[PDB]
Design an enzyme around this catalytic site. Sequence first.
Site, PDB file in Angstrom:
ATOM      1  N   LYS A  63       0.857  -1.222   0.067  1.00  0.00           N
ATOM      2  CA  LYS A  63      -0.061  -0.030   0.024  1.00  0.00           C
ATOM      3  C   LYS A  63       0.918   1.228  -0.039  1.00  0.00           C
ATOM      4  CE  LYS A  63      -4.239  -1.550   2.016  1.00  0.00           C
ATOM      5  NZ  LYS A  63      -4.099  -2.885   1.326  1.00  0.00           N
ATOM      6  N   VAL A  94     -20.382  10.125  16.871  1.00  0.00           N
ATOM      7  CA  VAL A  94     -21.379  10.149  17.744  1.00  0.00           C
ATOM      8  C   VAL A  94     -21.282   9.307  19.020  1.00  0.00           C
ATOM      9  CG1 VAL A  94     -23.587  10.520  18.741  1.00  0.00           C
ATOM     10  CG2 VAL A  94     -23.044  10.941  16.113  1.00  0.00           C
ATOM     11  N   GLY A 180      -7.969  14.576  26.342  1.00  0.00           N
ATOM     12  CA  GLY A 180      -9.419  14.440  25.665  1.00  0.00           C
ATOM     13  C   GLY A 180     -10.516  14.204  26.616  1.00  0.00           C
TER      14      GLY A 180
HETATM   15 NA    NA Z   1     -19.308   6.382  18.463  1.00  0.00          NA
END
Ligand code: NA
Length: 323
Positions: A63, A94, A180
């Site tokens: 690749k 989400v 995060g």
């Molecule tokens: Na998700």
Amino acid sequence: TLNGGITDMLTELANFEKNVSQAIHKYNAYRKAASVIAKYPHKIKSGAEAKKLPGVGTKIAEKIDEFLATGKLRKLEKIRQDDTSSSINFLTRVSGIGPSAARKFVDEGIKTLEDLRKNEDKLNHHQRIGLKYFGDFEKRIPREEMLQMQDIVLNEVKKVDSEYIATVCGSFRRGAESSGDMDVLLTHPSFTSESTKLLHQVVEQLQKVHFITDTLSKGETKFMGVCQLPSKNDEKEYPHRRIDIRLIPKDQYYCGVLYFTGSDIFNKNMRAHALEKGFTINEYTIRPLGVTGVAGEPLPVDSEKDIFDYIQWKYREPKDRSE
DNA sequence: CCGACCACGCATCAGC
DNA sequence: GCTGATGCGA
DNA sequence: GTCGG
Ligand code: NA
Ligand code: NA
Ligand code: NA
């Protein structure tokens, strides 16, 4: 700039494997490959060069050869333009919507945040919260805000019972400039592996002072929710953040803190090391290993250092646990 | 050749 | 009703 | 997909 094109390619491939093909092990394989390549201090010139690194095999080498020669990867270009696959991949962003839910939503024509908004009745509680904070959840948390968040967490926890012990872990504890989310490990002298609303009372106080705004899940030992720093009049509103709170038995607390502070590479190495010294370390304990490989009873641990002492390793500061 | 790889607690579903 | 499996994001 | 028993 070195091999960013290669690392982005691999990362994108990883996501499709996880979200569309539901192949978690290929997902990790691509990420592993991407990570080792991200650390390689040279601009890769061929797939053969890249294959010498651990985690890069024959196919990823091929690749890379294609990407270097043409500046793209046919399979990735095709996947990107595929309405079904790009939508599935997108919906998983989400929180609450995994590969399974994303696939089911797309099968019935729900492909965008807009479609989700008008199909609330089809979303569970977690997913609705994930939709509501879609944007905030993808933003990172500057260390300064993390410090402000810690201030509130430690203050309220102590206010409920000055005997609680709370520690904010994650990369934040290792000194990271941004996080995060916030991961708080909690314990109390009255809760051990043998004898025992410890978590509930802390969660409740945080909701009472309006720091915690939403609940994703909540049990007797683990809370997952949303929180938000208070803003001063005028000043803009801080974004909502993800926060987890784990109640851990006092006698397993420090093994928990060690684990949840990482990094992951550091954990792997520390575990590997321990085995050498005849010890088996996991998230909960550190146990000795008999000459036949049988694990003995958990050894007493009252600090992170105790763990390090057991394996005759010098105590390393969280900041120095990148590996 | 072919299995490992693989945080586990909580929400919710599938089945009885 | 309950028990176990599955999805999910840690 | 990669590694390795
Ligand atoms: Na998700
Ligand atoms: Na390799
Ligand atoms: Na069952």
